[model samples]
Target: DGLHSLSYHPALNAILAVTSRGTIKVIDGTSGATLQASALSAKGQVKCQYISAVDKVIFVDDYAVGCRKDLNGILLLDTALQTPVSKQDDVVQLELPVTEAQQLLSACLEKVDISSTEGYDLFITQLKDGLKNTSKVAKWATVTFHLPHHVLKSIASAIVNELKKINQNVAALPVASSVMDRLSYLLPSVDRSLMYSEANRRETFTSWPHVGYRWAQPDPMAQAGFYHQPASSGDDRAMCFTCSVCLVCWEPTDEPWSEHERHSPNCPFVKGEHTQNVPLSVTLATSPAQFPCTDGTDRISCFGSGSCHFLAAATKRGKICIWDVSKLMKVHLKFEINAYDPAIVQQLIEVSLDITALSILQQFPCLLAGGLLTYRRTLPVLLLYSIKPGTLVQCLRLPKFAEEENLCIDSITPCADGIHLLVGLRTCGGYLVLYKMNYEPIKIQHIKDPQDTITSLILLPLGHLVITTQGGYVKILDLSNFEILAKVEPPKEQDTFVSVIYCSGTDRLCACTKGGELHFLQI
Candidate 1:
């Protein structure tokens, strides 16, 4: 017969196994060796069984026999055994009302059969009929027979199977239908009436005609574009807008109120109210004009204006030309670099590297460019330019690292003392190189054993570096001691590789992954 139950005997350091055939076997759990076997009872077949450690006994029941533990031996009881006990004990014996004891035996047999499955259904039916006739005995009998272990187990299995089928059916449905099914399931658990009332309130509150446009702020006061005059009066009130569509929150001040406004007094977009739209042009402290560098170009990436106003332009021949926006207004050439030279440019402009990654030393006004040359190489080119006169871009080369054979610069960030640059090589090794521009050449430091390709590096507060890899591992290192402090696996729900990490100056670090998920982590 099959083994029904298994348990550990802590005192004996063994495991006990009980079988449906009423045999008990003890085994050494560690070695999986059988120790002893004994016939527990003569029940032949046990429907259910339990062992009591405090009493040191096992219980089993069959149709013909019931056994209980005793000091002398196992007390075997049947219908014949109960008859003798009833006759000797006056308390067990009843008044001489019945014709014979044989009739009582027949009645007991009938009661035993009624306690089985067929009688259980009749008891539940009676309970459904009414609770008035639900006497304590009847209620106990109903529970004991109808809600047995096997019946409950069967009902639970049925429920689980039905749920699985419903889930499968939902998965087979279309996307819209699946969304509807989810909403339907959630609506019953939420306050549906409140949601409907909110929607109706919103419909009644915002009703107006609107137009949209793109607006840019040059300075203040005078505005341009679809409207002739500027709306604001001061520099503080001037704001730039860049949308194609105009969004009107209210009607013109001169227009009469519509019927809809009369019907809905709470509406904010009624007539005779101020209408707001972005003006196209903005007034500037200085005269605003387009730079002359766009003469032979369709678009320009404005790198902002300072002492050296850098502007990059793209030509029809796929060449990227960099120029000083200030100097171009005076001279014809005005310092330009054609990126598509030698026919081996590798489309660096397409990769959004026209300006390249620059690190500016705060103490000394110097610019450094880390240019990606090839798939496996990066050129750390330094440019020393004067900011006062906006001079020409001068290129300088720094001393290469000892392990610079196949390294590519991944990121560069300016530090208070110097400049920090992260370089990733082909052999899964990375370096956190630091550079400073004095008479001495730039200093280079190496960080290795990254275990995977380093995708990005972020400088943490208090002189620490956070590195993200293609293998979804984030590590924090203390640059002062060159010691790794913590490493963590990204959240499992964000199964994509980490693209970049941004440290917010606190213990919180934000990581963006390839799967478009932003994860926040703490120490």
Candidate 2:
């Protein structure tokens, strides 16, 4: 039968899987031991072969619990299980203090000691004397010497696998597979024990792409293929996902699609189906509106959508609304709609009541893989829940706000790199900041328009921006160098444009005015 899903709970030493045969199997990742087994469905005198215990699994907890939902409510196996520890050579454990090693790895994730981190480079370099050329794994330098948490997890796993391999050289007793899975990390604090359990704790992604990545449970495994959490954002870059389940050393140029299949074919994400390209015309030909707010009741201050078609807008009385503007949806794919009806205003619950009263809504695109980005305060934060259960995938910061001046984010547009961003500041003289992928400010320019204020900002092709100012000038500025590549006079010859959008899909530019009238600028 097919293996439907799999997951790893940090506190547990086993990999839990759900098979198509409706059985849950907990196997050790290292020795592949079936530690525990149970059926997905309950047993009874009256048998229903078709109905499994839990037909589907919705991941729960940080990394501690797995929940399956079916005719029954929610079922989980979150009991903490302990594995006994026995070793091949206790001498190896004697020399390397595990307590110190645990602290070293924690510091890296915490970025505790800056200088201690420098030691990691040197230690990895000098490791020829450490053990093998590849012996970057710490033995003596566990306390002060640094190691990446993700890397440390892999190194710990390697030790168990290496020990399990053919060892003709020294000839020691075999370490019990169950015990090794539990204690393979060498330091109790350094391994699964220290791994955060998802049971009740909120999981937060400290970085990008992976910002909202979560795990799969009762189902048996997450669709494994590729996931990217780059130091910068952009789908243009090749796959840079870290496989928490499959362990492999990736080359800088290695394609994740092929690499994932070559190593873990059982992984559904890369079994054959991977994300593919779609026609731009398809996106443009059918965007009449998926519940557009034509009533014009809410003055949109900020607006943007993710690649996943998650549309968000901030408006009147500090309200933010999100809509499932799904792209090529099953019910709407290849479907066409010409006229737009006024939005019925089915809100996606409440976003937050904390935003300052809205006026000039500056917008930005973020968490495009599946979530949203909005001005949280004067500081911009992400709203991501669908991706993960809670905070694990949340980002508390974004491209910086102007430090010297009293400015607010006027608008944020995700560039071609996806995260290489263009920021317009609602500052004196309307400042624009061009940034690289990491939110690093590279250049800043002041708009010379007499309007002195910005109303709306839209993204144009070629690192360009459609900047609408109170001066009635809709200028396309090449943000790369603060050059004005093109400009369009407002059609109504109004003093300023209110809200503006450069429709990349349809090759159209639209702007609105305070009078509630929209005008399409002639190219």
Candidate 3:
């Protein structure tokens, strides 16, 4: 039988797949090797909708379980292969006696000035240094402490901001003439779209796809920000956009990302510091590391992002599984998504139900799962669950309008500010509502068109709301007052907007049309 459900753990780099026979197998995402396996069925077939959690935890909700008599409402399963250390275990003592340690600790604490931010930062730095420098025998220095998830996120963003400032400041410095010339040379000579196009890049390599050339793949070169600029008589020459570095020869053993980074460590793209110079569409499509593939023919049902970015897929058999696509071992963003200029980043958010779309809480890792609450599909509910603790936090019910009891939650999205949420209701005419995190409705806007059905809702990182309708109309709304900022329609009158995504780097919005065409709008 085929898989009933599937979920990918980005942190673990593994896939949790539940076969139709009620068996769960943890397979390596990179490699197809099965790492671990377990069976949930004792009496009958047991399949579950699973989610990967933080701290190596996997939550399995076996609503249709094997044995109904046993405990089954959302089981918290530990995926840690090795047993965790016992908290009661005694740690290694310092070589310096407890009396001297006490004195040193007291002196250290006395010097710590809680009045300034750097005071705490410096103390933390010293502790980290000490822990790193400790001898093997003093391994107990490996003491673990929990930091608030938001605090960690704050520090990460702060670090990114500081790095950006450094880069900008360095750029402004009156550096050497050679450096300036190289930096200018690093700028692409051709249009970014031309450079990103695979067909154009492949055409430049005359001997490409020939049997003589083992390195015939043009995808790897294009993905590494390289356009086919041949300097030599042969077709083995290529140039990079960010580093201005050129490789004259291509060997069979050569790799794109590795070779690019090796030549110029200062290049922002190669250094994994910035994505400004790279084509996001090309990068995401060409690199297996950047794009993730779901199992077999399962289509993506819902998308969720927060501290983690993920895609949940549903099998034809009504089995649900989620995959984490944020695992970029070497690739990292040096700036936060919110740091992008609002003028450049056109924002939009979306929500859904049946095919349940989900959102994550900003302050906490609570999943806001929204769908029809009752069997009759009369009441819509949003269930909040702590992904880390695998516990149900609360349930919030949506308001039922008098005219329509068959209303369903079509789309849902939350603001980056952590204060507001947006929900789209499927009705005769589009019904959109803004809500506080506490489930209290703040504003409602009902579209007048009786034939306009809300198909999808998108909220951009910059706080712009995008509503796509079955009537082939795409409207952008400003959440400040729930006002329509822009109303856009597809090129073809009959083509309905399926999905739209904004690429901040290029300042463009790519909208997929029902006519199998991609419309790129320059916002």
lDDT string, candidate 3, 1-523, tens digits: 4443344443344445555565665554444455545543222233232223222222222221111100111111211111111232212111121222232233334422222332335334533544454421121122121233223223323332343445542211111111112122212124433442333444455444333444436756666767676544565667775467887666777777778878877776677543334232322211211111222233334434443544332222233433443321121211111112232122111222243556666545566656453332345656565544334466566565612456667667776344777777764175677888763478777776854665555565527766566766667666777677666786764766654545443445555555544455667
Q: Which ten residues in a row have the lowest lDDT in candidate 2?
A: 44-53
Cα lDDT for residue 518, model 2? 45
RMSD of each: 31.9, 26.1, 24.1
lDDT per residue as tens, model 2, 1-523: 4343343322323345544454555544344445554442221111011111112222211111112221111122211111111343221111112232333333322422233332344433322232332121122121121233333334434432443343321111111121122233333241222122111011112222222223321111112323322234432122212224443334434443455566666542343321111112211111112212333344433333443334444443333444433322111111111111111011111132222211111133233211222223233322222221111222323345443344545455566334465556564276666655442456666766557466655555536666666766666666566576556565543534445554333344555444434455544
Write down the lDDT of every candidate, Cα atoms only: 0.32, 0.33, 0.43
Candidate 3 clash total?
13
Order of candidate numbers by TM-score, starting with the best: 3, 1, 2
Model 2: lDDT to the true structure = 0.33
After superposition, which runs of candidate 2 have C-alpha atoms over 4 Å from their true positions? 1-303, 313-323, 327-386, 389-404, 416-419, 448-452, 488-523
Identify the candidate with maximal lDDT.
Answer: 3
Candidate 1 clash pair list: 211-246, 212-245, 212-246, 213-245, 213-246, 215-241, 219-283, 220-283
lDDT of 1 by residue, 1-523 (tens): 3444343433233344555456654444344355544443232333111122222222232221111222111111111111111111111111110111222223223322323432345333423432323221221111111233333223223322333334322211121121122122112222222111112212222211221211221111112111111233321221111112122222233121232334344332232121121111100001112222334323322221211234222222222333333211122222343433332242222211233343333333434334434324444333334333224244444345522555444455554233343332332165555554342133445545545556555555427777666677767666665567766676666454453333222334444444434455666
Candidate ranking under lDDT, highest first, comes to: 3, 2, 1
